[PDB]
Amino acid sequence: PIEIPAGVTVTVNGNTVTVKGPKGELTRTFHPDMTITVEGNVITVTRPSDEKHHRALHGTTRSLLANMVEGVSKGYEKALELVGVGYRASKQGKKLVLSVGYSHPVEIEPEEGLEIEVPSQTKIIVKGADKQRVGELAANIRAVRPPEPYKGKGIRYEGELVRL
């Protein structure tokens, strides 16, 4: 079973599961053949048979739930860094404002369930409960102005190896 940490509320309705927590809320549907139940303090997954496809479905369903529980409790994040003189980021409302060498700034507003933090003018942190959506928004930010080959200016992931 999956342990429901504190602060986390799990709701099951047929094949749709909703998990809420301090870091966010996520709703997910699972394979019909799988039975999901909140057994007091733990989430249990019961497969219909012992054939292989079910055994595989069972472990796959279990993992997804575990990660849904990890996301709203612990949350996920991806950091990016700005490299280049005059290149800076700031937070104006829910919006990320980027000054990356164009005539005017680029403003990005995260969708629902996503946050963007700017702890220093050259560091951007994207966070949320869905690891995928976090990965996707950070790739979209970097894509505004990826690192150029001669000097490495642009936006790069925090540990991005971009040798000039």
Side-chain angles (χ1 to χ4, degrees), residues 8-82:
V8 173
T9 304
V10 177
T11 288
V12 184
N13 166 57
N15 66 326
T16 319
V17 177
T18 297
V19 184
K20 323 162 61 168
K23 302 307 206 302
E25 190 176 334
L26 303 172
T27 293
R28 211 180 188 300
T29 286
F30 299 82
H31 194 287
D33 286 14
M34 298 293 112
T35 299
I36 300 167
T37 68
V38 175
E39 229 76 82
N41 49 7
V42 293
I43 315 162
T44 302
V45 188
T46 293
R47 58 176 180 247
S49 83
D50 287 294
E51 280 192 71
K52 183 187 182 184
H53 63 265
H54 283 133
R55 185 162 294 95
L57 264 169
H58 196 199
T60 295
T61 297
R62 235 151 54 211
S63 306
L64 269 52
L65 282 160
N67 294 354
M68 281 180 91
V69 176
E70 197 184 329
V72 306
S73 67
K74 299 166 189 180
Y76 298 98
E77 56 179 65
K78 189 68 202 63
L80 297 147
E81 36 197 41
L82 294 206

Coordinates of all heavy atoms in Angstrom, one line a residue, residues 8-82:
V8 N -2.1 15.4 3.7 CA -2.5 14.9 2.4 C -3.9 14.2 2.4 O -4.2 13.4 3.3 CB -1.5 13.8 1.8 CG1 -2.0 13.1 0.5 CG2 -0.1 14.6 1.5
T9 N -4.8 14.6 1.6 CA -6.1 14.1 1.4 C -6.3 13.3 0.1 O -5.9 13.8 -1.0 CB -7.2 15.2 1.4 OG1 -7.0 16.0 2.6 CG2 -8.6 14.6 1.4
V10 N -6.7 12.0 0.2 CA -6.8 11.2 -1.0 C -8.3 10.9 -1.2 O -9.0 10.5 -0.3 CB -6.0 9.9 -0.9 CG1 -6.3 9.0 -2.2 CG2 -4.6 10.2 -0.8
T11 N -8.8 11.1 -2.4 CA -10.2 10.8 -2.7 C -10.3 9.9 -3.9 O -9.6 10.1 -4.9 CB -11.0 12.1 -3.0 OG1 -11.2 12.8 -1.7 CG2 -12.4 11.8 -3.6
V12 N -11.1 8.8 -3.9 CA -11.2 7.9 -4.9 C -12.7 7.8 -5.4 O -13.6 7.6 -4.5 CB -10.8 6.5 -4.5 CG1 -10.8 5.5 -5.7 CG2 -9.3 6.5 -4.0
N13 N -12.9 7.8 -6.7 CA -14.3 7.7 -7.2 C -14.2 6.9 -8.5 O -13.9 7.4 -9.5 CB -14.7 9.1 -7.5 CG -16.0 9.1 -8.4 OD1 -17.0 8.6 -8.0 ND2 -15.9 9.8 -9.5
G14 N -14.4 5.6 -8.3 CA -14.3 4.7 -9.5 C -12.8 4.6 -9.9 O -12.0 4.2 -9.1
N15 N -12.5 5.0 -11.1 CA -11.1 4.9 -11.5 C -10.3 6.3 -11.5 O -9.2 6.3 -12.0 CB -11.0 4.3 -12.9 CG -11.6 5.2 -14.0 OD1 -12.6 5.9 -13.8 ND2 -11.0 5.2 -15.2
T16 N -11.0 7.3 -10.9 CA -10.4 8.6 -10.9 C -9.9 8.8 -9.4 O -10.7 8.7 -8.5 CB -11.4 9.7 -11.2 OG1 -12.2 9.3 -12.3 CG2 -10.7 11.0 -11.6
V17 N -8.7 9.2 -9.2 CA -8.1 9.5 -7.9 C -7.7 11.0 -7.8 O -6.9 11.5 -8.6 CB -6.9 8.6 -7.7 CG1 -6.3 9.0 -6.4 CG2 -7.3 7.2 -7.7
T18 N -8.1 11.6 -6.7 CA -7.7 13.0 -6.5 C -6.8 13.0 -5.2 O -7.2 12.5 -4.2 CB -8.9 14.0 -6.3 OG1 -9.6 14.1 -7.6 CG2 -8.3 15.4 -6.0
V19 N -5.6 13.6 -5.3 CA -4.7 13.8 -4.1 C -4.5 15.3 -3.9 O -4.2 16.0 -4.9 CB -3.4 13.0 -4.4 CG1 -2.5 13.0 -3.1 CG2 -3.7 11.5 -4.7
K20 N -4.6 15.8 -2.7 CA -4.4 17.2 -2.4 C -3.3 17.2 -1.3 O -3.3 16.3 -0.5 CB -5.6 17.8 -1.8 CG -6.9 17.4 -2.4 CD -8.0 17.7 -1.5 CE -8.1 19.2 -1.3 NZ -9.4 19.6 -0.6
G21 N -2.6 18.3 -1.3 CA -1.5 18.4 -0.3 C -1.0 19.8 -0.3 O -1.5 20.7 -1.0
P22 N 0.0 20.1 0.6 CA 0.5 21.5 0.6 C 1.1 22.0 -0.7 O 0.9 23.2 -1.0 CB 1.6 21.4 1.7 CG 1.9 19.9 1.8 CD 0.5 19.3 1.6
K23 N 1.7 21.1 -1.5 CA 2.3 21.5 -2.7 C 1.4 21.5 -3.9 O 1.9 21.9 -5.0 CB 3.5 20.7 -3.0 CG 4.6 20.7 -1.9 CD 5.0 22.1 -1.6 CE 6.4 22.2 -1.1 NZ 6.5 21.4 0.2
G24 N 0.2 21.1 -3.8 CA -0.7 21.1 -5.0 C -1.8 20.1 -4.9 O -2.0 19.3 -3.9
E25 N -2.6 19.9 -6.0 CA -3.7 19.0 -6.1 C -3.6 18.3 -7.4 O -3.4 19.0 -8.4 CB -5.0 19.7 -5.9 CG -6.2 18.8 -5.7 CD -7.6 19.5 -5.5 OE1 -7.5 20.7 -5.0 OE2 -8.6 19.0 -5.8
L26 N -3.8 17.0 -7.5 CA -3.7 16.3 -8.8 C -4.7 15.2 -8.9 O -5.0 14.5 -7.9 CB -2.3 15.5 -8.9 CG -1.0 16.2 -8.7 CD1 0.2 15.2 -8.6 CD2 -0.8 17.2 -9.9
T27 N -5.4 15.1 -10.0 CA -6.4 14.2 -10.3 C -5.9 13.3 -11.4 O -5.5 13.8 -12.4 CB -7.7 14.8 -10.7 OG1 -8.2 15.6 -9.6 CG2 -8.8 13.8 -11.1
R28 N -6.1 12.0 -11.3 CA -5.6 11.1 -12.3 C -6.6 9.9 -12.4 O -7.2 9.4 -11.4 CB -4.2 10.6 -11.9 CG -3.4 10.2 -13.2 CD -2.0 9.8 -12.9 NE -1.2 9.6 -14.1 CZ -1.5 8.8 -15.1 NH1 -2.6 8.1 -15.1 NH2 -0.8 8.8 -16.2
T29 N -6.7 9.4 -13.6 CA -7.6 8.2 -13.9 C -6.6 7.0 -14.1 O -5.5 7.2 -14.7 CB -8.5 8.5 -15.1 OG1 -9.6 9.3 -14.7 CG2 -9.1 7.2 -15.6
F30 N -7.0 5.9 -13.7 CA -6.2 4.6 -13.8 C -7.0 3.5 -14.6 O -8.2 3.6 -14.8 CB -5.8 4.2 -12.4 CG -4.9 5.2 -11.7 CD1 -5.5 6.2 -11.0 CD2 -3.5 5.0 -11.8 CE1 -4.7 7.2 -10.4 CE2 -2.7 6.0 -11.1 CZ -3.3 7.0 -10.4
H31 N -6.2 2.5 -15.0 CA -6.8 1.4 -15.7 C -8.0 0.8 -15.0 O -7.9 0.3 -13.8 CB -5.7 0.4 -15.9 CG -6.1 -0.7 -17.0 ND1 -7.0 -1.7 -16.7 CD2 -5.7 -0.8 -18.3 CE1 -7.1 -2.4 -17.8 NE2 -6.3 -1.9 -18.8
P32 N -9.1 0.7 -15.6 CA -10.4 0.1 -15.1 C -10.2 -1.1 -14.3 O -10.9 -1.3 -13.3 CB -11.2 -0.1 -16.4 CG -10.8 1.0 -17.2 CD -9.3 1.1 -17.0
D33 N -9.4 -2.0 -14.8 CA -9.2 -3.3 -14.1 C -8.6 -3.2 -12.7 O -8.6 -4.2 -12.0 CB -8.3 -4.2 -15.0 CG -9.1 -4.8 -16.1 OD1 -10.2 -4.3 -16.5 OD2 -8.6 -5.8 -16.7
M34 N -8.0 -2.1 -12.4 CA -7.4 -1.9 -11.1 C -8.4 -1.4 -10.1 O -9.1 -0.5 -10.4 CB -6.1 -1.0 -11.2 CG -5.0 -1.5 -12.1 SD -4.2 -3.0 -11.5 CE -4.7 -4.3 -12.7
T35 N -8.4 -1.9 -8.8 CA -9.2 -1.3 -7.8 C -8.3 -0.6 -6.8 O -7.3 -1.2 -6.4 CB -10.0 -2.4 -7.0 OG1 -10.9 -3.1 -8.0 CG2 -11.0 -1.8 -6.0
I36 N -8.7 0.6 -6.6 CA -8.0 1.5 -5.7 C -8.9 1.9 -4.5 O -10.0 2.3 -4.7 CB -7.5 2.8 -6.4 CG1 -6.6 2.4 -7.6 CG2 -6.7 3.7 -5.5 CD1 -6.4 3.5 -8.5
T37 N -8.3 1.7 -3.3 CA -9.1 2.0 -2.1 C -8.2 2.7 -1.0 O -7.1 2.3 -0.8 CB -9.7 0.7 -1.5 OG1 -8.7 -0.2 -0.9 CG2 -10.5 -0.1 -2.5
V38 N -8.8 3.6 -0.3 CA -8.2 4.3 0.8 C -8.5 3.4 2.0 O -9.7 3.4 2.5 CB -8.6 5.8 1.0 CG1 -8.0 6.4 2.3 CG2 -8.3 6.6 -0.2
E39 N -7.6 2.6 2.5 CA -7.7 1.8 3.6 C -7.3 2.6 4.9 O -6.2 2.4 5.3 CB -6.9 0.5 3.5 CG -7.6 -0.8 3.7 CD -8.5 -1.2 2.6 OE1 -8.0 -1.8 1.6 OE2 -9.7 -1.0 2.6
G40 N -8.2 3.4 5.4 CA -7.8 4.3 6.5 C -6.7 5.3 6.2 O -6.9 6.4 5.7
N41 N -5.5 4.8 6.6 CA -4.3 5.6 6.4 C -3.4 5.3 5.2 O -2.3 5.9 5.1 CB -3.4 5.5 7.7 CG -3.3 4.0 8.2 OD1 -3.7 3.1 7.5 ND2 -2.7 3.9 9.4
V42 N -3.7 4.3 4.4 CA -2.9 3.9 3.3 C -3.8 3.6 2.0 O -5.0 3.3 2.2 CB -2.1 2.6 3.5 CG1 -1.1 2.9 4.5 CG2 -3.1 1.5 4.0
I43 N -3.2 3.8 0.9 CA -3.9 3.6 -0.4 C -3.5 2.2 -0.8 O -2.4 1.8 -0.8 CB -3.5 4.5 -1.5 CG1 -3.4 6.0 -1.0 CG2 -4.5 4.5 -2.7 CD1 -2.5 6.9 -1.8
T44 N -4.5 1.3 -1.1 CA -4.2 0.0 -1.5 C -4.6 -0.2 -3.0 O -5.6 0.4 -3.4 CB -4.9 -1.0 -0.6 OG1 -4.5 -0.8 0.8 CG2 -4.6 -2.5 -0.9
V45 N -3.9 -1.0 -3.8 CA -4.2 -1.3 -5.2 C -4.5 -2.8 -5.3 O -3.6 -3.6 -4.9 CB -3.1 -0.9 -6.2 CG1 -3.6 -1.1 -7.6 CG2 -2.7 0.5 -5.9
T46 N -5.6 -3.2 -5.8 CA -5.9 -4.7 -5.9 C -6.1 -5.0 -7.4 O -6.9 -4.3 -8.0 CB -7.3 -5.0 -5.1 OG1 -7.1 -4.8 -3.7 CG2 -7.7 -6.5 -5.4
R47 N -5.4 -5.9 -7.9 CA -5.5 -6.3 -9.3 C -6.6 -7.5 -9.3 O -6.7 -8.2 -8.4 CB -4.2 -6.8 -9.9 CG -3.6 -7.9 -9.2 CD -2.3 -8.5 -9.8 NE -1.8 -9.6 -9.0 CZ -0.6 -9.6 -8.3 NH1 0.1 -8.5 -8.4 NH2 -0.2 -10.6 -7.6
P48 N -7.3 -7.7 -10.5 CA -8.3 -8.7 -10.6 C -7.8 -10.2 -10.6 O -8.5 -11.1 -10.2 CB -9.0 -8.3 -11.8 CG -8.0 -7.7 -12.7 CD -7.2 -6.8 -11.7
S49 N -6.6 -10.4 -11.2 CA -6.0 -11.7 -11.3 C -4.5 -11.7 -11.1 O -3.9 -10.7 -10.9 CB -6.3 -12.3 -12.7 OG -5.5 -11.9 -13.7
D50 N -3.9 -12.9 -11.3 CA -2.4 -13.0 -11.2 C -1.7 -13.2 -12.5 O -0.6 -13.7 -12.5 CB -2.1 -14.2 -10.2 CG -2.4 -13.8 -8.7 OD1 -1.7 -12.9 -8.1 OD2 -3.3 -14.5 -8.1
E51 N -2.4 -12.9 -13.6 CA -1.7 -13.1 -14.9 C -0.6 -12.0 -14.9 O -0.6 -11.2 -14.0 CB -2.7 -12.9 -16.0 CG -3.6 -14.1 -16.3 CD -4.3 -13.9 -17.6 OE1 -3.7 -13.9 -18.7 OE2 -5.5 -13.6 -17.6
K52 N 0.2 -12.1 -16.0 CA 1.3 -11.1 -16.1 C 0.8 -9.7 -16.3 O 1.3 -8.8 -15.6 CB 2.3 -11.5 -17.2 CG 3.5 -10.6 -17.4 CD 4.3 -11.0 -18.6 CE 5.6 -10.2 -18.8 NZ 6.4 -10.5 -20.0
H53 N 0.0 -9.4 -17.3 CA -0.4 -8.1 -17.6 C -1.0 -7.3 -16.4 O -0.8 -6.1 -16.3 CB -1.4 -8.1 -18.9 CG -2.7 -8.8 -18.7 ND1 -2.9 -10.1 -19.1 CD2 -3.9 -8.4 -18.2 CE1 -4.1 -10.4 -18.8 NE2 -4.7 -9.4 -18.3
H54 N -1.6 -8.1 -15.6 CA -2.2 -7.5 -14.3 C -1.1 -7.2 -13.4 O -1.1 -6.1 -12.7 CB -3.2 -8.4 -13.7 CG -4.5 -8.4 -14.4 ND1 -5.2 -9.5 -14.7 CD2 -5.3 -7.3 -14.9 CE1 -6.3 -9.2 -15.4 NE2 -6.4 -7.9 -15.4
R55 N -0.2 -8.1 -13.2 CA 0.9 -7.9 -12.3 C 1.7 -6.7 -12.7 O 2.1 -5.9 -11.8 CB 1.8 -9.1 -12.3 CG 3.0 -9.1 -11.3 CD 3.6 -10.5 -11.0 NE 2.6 -11.4 -10.3 CZ 1.8 -12.3 -11.0 NH1 1.9 -12.4 -12.3 NH2 1.0 -13.0 -10.3
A56 N 1.8 -6.4 -14.0 CA 2.6 -5.3 -14.5 C 1.7 -4.0 -14.4 O 2.3 -2.9 -14.1 CB 2.9 -5.5 -16.0
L57 N 0.4 -4.1 -14.5 CA -0.5 -3.0 -14.4 C -0.5 -2.5 -12.9 O -0.4 -1.3 -12.6 CB -1.9 -3.4 -14.8 CG -2.4 -3.0 -16.2 CD1 -3.7 -3.7 -16.5 CD2 -2.5 -1.5 -16.4
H58 N -0.5 -3.5 -12.0 CA -0.5 -3.3 -10.6 C 0.7 -2.5 -10.1 O 0.5 -1.5 -9.4 CB -0.4 -4.7 -9.9 CG -0.8 -4.7 -8.5 ND1 -0.5 -5.8 -7.7 CD2 -1.5 -3.8 -7.7 CE1 -1.0 -5.5 -6.4 NE2 -1.6 -4.4 -6.5
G59 N 1.9 -2.9 -10.5 CA 3.1 -2.1 -10.1 C 3.2 -0.7 -10.7 O 3.6 0.2 -10.1
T60 N 2.7 -0.6 -12.0 CA 2.7 0.7 -12.7 C 1.7 1.6 -12.0 O 2.0 2.8 -11.9 CB 2.3 0.4 -14.2 OG1 3.3 -0.3 -14.8 CG2 2.1 1.7 -14.9
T61 N 0.5 1.1 -11.7 CA -0.5 1.9 -11.0 C 0.0 2.4 -9.6 O -0.2 3.6 -9.2 CB -1.8 1.0 -10.7 OG1 -2.3 0.7 -12.0 CG2 -2.9 1.8 -10.0
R62 N 0.6 1.5 -8.9 CA 1.2 1.8 -7.6 C 2.3 2.9 -7.7 O 2.3 3.8 -6.9 CB 1.9 0.5 -7.0 CG 1.4 0.1 -5.7 CD 1.5 -1.4 -5.5 NE 2.8 -2.0 -5.8 CZ 3.0 -3.2 -6.3 NH1 2.1 -4.0 -6.6 NH2 4.3 -3.6 -6.5
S63 N 3.1 2.8 -8.7 CA 4.2 3.9 -8.8 C 3.5 5.2 -9.1 O 3.9 6.2 -8.4 CB 5.1 3.5 -10.0 OG 5.6 2.2 -9.8
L64 N 2.6 5.3 -10.0 CA 1.9 6.6 -10.3 C 1.3 7.2 -9.1 O 1.4 8.4 -8.9 CB 0.8 6.3 -11.4 CG 1.3 6.5 -12.8 CD1 2.5 5.7 -13.1 CD2 0.2 6.1 -13.7
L65 N 0.7 6.4 -8.2 CA 0.1 6.9 -7.0 C 1.2 7.4 -6.1 O 1.1 8.5 -5.6 CB -0.7 5.8 -6.3 CG -2.1 5.4 -6.8 CD1 -2.5 4.0 -6.4 CD2 -3.1 6.5 -6.4
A66 N 2.2 6.6 -5.9 CA 3.3 7.0 -5.1 C 3.8 8.4 -5.5 O 3.9 9.3 -4.6 CB 4.5 6.0 -5.1
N67 N 4.1 8.6 -6.7 CA 4.6 9.9 -7.3 C 3.6 11.0 -7.2 O 4.0 12.2 -7.1 CB 5.0 9.7 -8.8 CG 6.2 8.8 -8.9 OD1 6.9 8.4 -8.0 ND2 6.5 8.6 -10.2
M68 N 2.3 10.7 -7.2 CA 1.2 11.7 -7.0 C 1.3 12.1 -5.6 O 1.1 13.3 -5.3 CB -0.2 11.1 -7.3 CG -0.6 10.9 -8.7 SD -2.2 10.2 -8.7 CE -3.3 11.7 -8.8
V69 N 1.5 11.2 -4.7 CA 1.6 11.5 -3.2 C 2.9 12.3 -3.0 O 2.9 13.3 -2.2 CB 1.6 10.2 -2.4 CG1 1.8 10.5 -0.9 CG2 0.2 9.5 -2.5
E70 N 4.0 12.0 -3.7 CA 5.3 12.7 -3.5 C 5.2 14.1 -4.0 O 5.6 15.1 -3.3 CB 6.4 12.0 -4.2 CG 7.7 12.4 -3.8 CD 8.9 11.7 -4.6 OE1 8.7 10.6 -5.0 OE2 9.9 12.4 -4.7
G71 N 4.5 14.3 -5.1 CA 4.3 15.7 -5.7 C 3.6 16.7 -4.9 O 4.0 17.8 -4.7
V72 N 2.4 16.3 -4.3 CA 1.7 17.2 -3.5 C 2.2 17.4 -2.1 O 1.8 18.3 -1.3 CB 0.1 16.9 -3.4 CG1 -0.4 16.7 -4.8 CG2 -0.1 15.6 -2.6
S73 N 3.1 16.5 -1.7 CA 3.6 16.6 -0.3 C 5.0 17.2 -0.4 O 5.3 18.2 0.3 CB 3.7 15.2 0.4 OG 4.6 14.4 -0.2
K74 N 5.9 16.7 -1.2 CA 7.2 17.2 -1.4 C 7.4 18.1 -2.5 O 8.2 19.0 -2.5 CB 8.2 16.0 -1.5 CG 8.2 15.0 -0.3 CD 8.9 13.7 -0.7 CE 8.8 12.6 0.4 NZ 9.4 11.4 0.0
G75 N 6.5 18.0 -3.5 CA 6.6 18.9 -4.7 C 7.8 18.6 -5.6 O 8.8 17.9 -5.2
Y76 N 7.9 19.1 -6.8 CA 9.0 18.9 -7.7 C 9.5 20.3 -8.2 O 8.8 21.2 -8.2 CB 8.7 18.1 -8.9 CG 8.2 16.7 -8.6 CD1 6.9 16.4 -8.5 CD2 9.2 15.7 -8.3 CE1 6.5 15.1 -8.2 CE2 8.8 14.4 -8.0 CZ 7.4 14.1 -7.9 OH 7.0 12.8 -7.6
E77 N 10.8 20.4 -8.6 CA 11.3 21.6 -9.1 C 12.4 21.5 -10.1 O 13.1 20.5 -10.1 CB 11.7 22.6 -8.0 CG 12.8 22.0 -7.1 CD 13.2 23.0 -6.0 OE1 12.3 23.3 -5.2 OE2 14.3 23.4 -6.0
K78 N 12.6 22.5 -10.9 CA 13.6 22.5 -11.9 C 14.2 23.9 -12.0 O 13.4 24.9 -12.1 CB 13.0 22.1 -13.3 CG 14.1 21.8 -14.4 CD 14.9 20.6 -14.2 CE 16.2 20.6 -15.0 NZ 17.1 21.7 -14.5
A79 N 15.5 24.1 -11.8 CA 16.1 25.4 -11.9 C 16.8 25.7 -13.2 O 17.2 24.8 -13.9 CB 17.1 25.5 -10.7
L80 N 16.8 27.0 -13.6 CA 17.5 27.5 -14.8 C 18.3 28.7 -14.4 O 18.1 29.3 -13.3 CB 16.4 28.0 -15.8 CG 15.4 27.0 -16.3 CD1 14.1 27.8 -16.5 CD2 15.8 26.4 -17.6
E81 N 19.3 29.0 -15.2 CA 20.2 30.1 -14.9 C 20.4 31.0 -16.1 O 20.3 30.5 -17.2 CB 21.5 29.7 -14.3 CG 22.1 28.4 -14.8 CD 23.1 27.8 -13.9 OE1 22.9 27.8 -12.6 OE2 24.1 27.2 -14.4
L82 N 20.5 32.3 -15.9 CA 20.7 33.3 -17.0 C 22.2 33.6 -17.1 O 22.9 33.8 -16.1 CB 20.0 34.6 -16.8 CG 18.5 34.6 -16.8 CD1 18.0 36.0 -17.1 CD2 17.9 33.7 -17.7

